């Protein structure tokens, strides 16, 4: 479970993203597709080229969802219920692949917010993304 400090850390870090939430979302996807090309196979109807508008648009969606999850950090499963159904039942994403996007999100945040990305904040963000992931695959915290 997320601690009071975890919650403070997550809200603070994600707040530091400024006007660039969508950009960072798109960067994380771009990193994931390059390092872990298996993930590209979930997006057959996407142009996945570098700087793709579809990827940029999708990164904004992922960012918006994370922004909402940070807002409702005390009730994650409720905030992400629709996305859980979508990823677990419609899209049928490999649960183990959530670790890949989570990793690429952390790398992106580290690359943009080096002052903010302390070991404690790192831990809080990883826990947060790990729970987002389990909620999305199985509606469990």
């Amino acid at each position: 479970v997320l601690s009071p400090a975890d919650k403070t850390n997550v809200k603070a870090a994600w707040g530091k993203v400024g006007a660039h939430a969508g950009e960072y979302g798109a960067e994380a996807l771009e990193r994931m597709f390059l390092s872990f090309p298996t993930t590209k196979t979930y997006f057959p109807h996407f142009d996945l080229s570098h700087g793709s508008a579809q990827v940029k648009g999708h990164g904004k969606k992922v960012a918006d969802a994370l922004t909402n999850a940070v807002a409702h950090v005390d009730d994650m499963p409720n905030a992400l219920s629709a996305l859980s159904d979508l990823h677990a039942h419609k899209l049928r994403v490999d649960p183990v692949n959530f670790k890949l996007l989570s990793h690429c999100l952390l790398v992106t945040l580290a690359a943009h917010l080096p002052a903010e990305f302390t070991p404690a904040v790192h831990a809080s963000l990883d826990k947060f993304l790990a729970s987002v992931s389990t909620v999305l695959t199985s509606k469990y915290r």
């Binding site: 990193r31 790398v107 992106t108 990305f117 070991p119 404690a120 790192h122």
Partner: protein, 146 residues
């Protein structure tokens, strides 16, 4: 391993810029904080109960240096990761019984620490080269298992 020409150049170049004295303790400390089960292997290191305790721990910092020093030595011969890590594989596998998944976790933490240090220079392309390094190091260290 099948490192491309570009992968090798990217890994060698970036490593020359790394603050090993700092990134070493950063990498091991973060692994211990983020993945608490890994603490099971470091009983003798003392208080590992929190980020503060872990990041100020002299033994963690010293050991993290050794880990990244070993990586730097492997970088001198990227066509030969298996050989470089052969004796280390016997240690981590036959003696310590660390699950191979954790080699990947440490590598991924190192990747995040490189991102902190290099910022926008740590491009998605540069990352992809380093992810191959992570996978290669993990495979080399896992050699004794199977």
């Amino acid at each position: 391993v099948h490192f491309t020409e570009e992968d090798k150049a990217t890994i060698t170049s970036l490593w020359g810029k790394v603050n090993v004295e700092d990134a070493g303790g950063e990498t091991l400390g973060r692994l211990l904080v983020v993945y608490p089960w890994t603490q099971r292997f470091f009983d003798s290191f003392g208080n590992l109960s929190s980020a503060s305790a872990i990041m100020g721990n002299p033994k963690v910092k010293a050991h993290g240096k050794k880990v990244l020093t070993s990586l730097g030595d492997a970088i001198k011969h990227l066509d030969d990761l298996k050989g470089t890590f052969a004796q280390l594989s016997e240690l981590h596998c036959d003696k310590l019984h660390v699950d191979p998944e954790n080699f990947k976790l440490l590598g991924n933490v190192l990747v995040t620490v490189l991102a902190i240090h290099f910022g926008k220079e740590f491009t998605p392309e540069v990352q992809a080269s380093w992810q191959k390094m992570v996978t290669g190091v993990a495979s080399a260290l896992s050699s004794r298992y199977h």
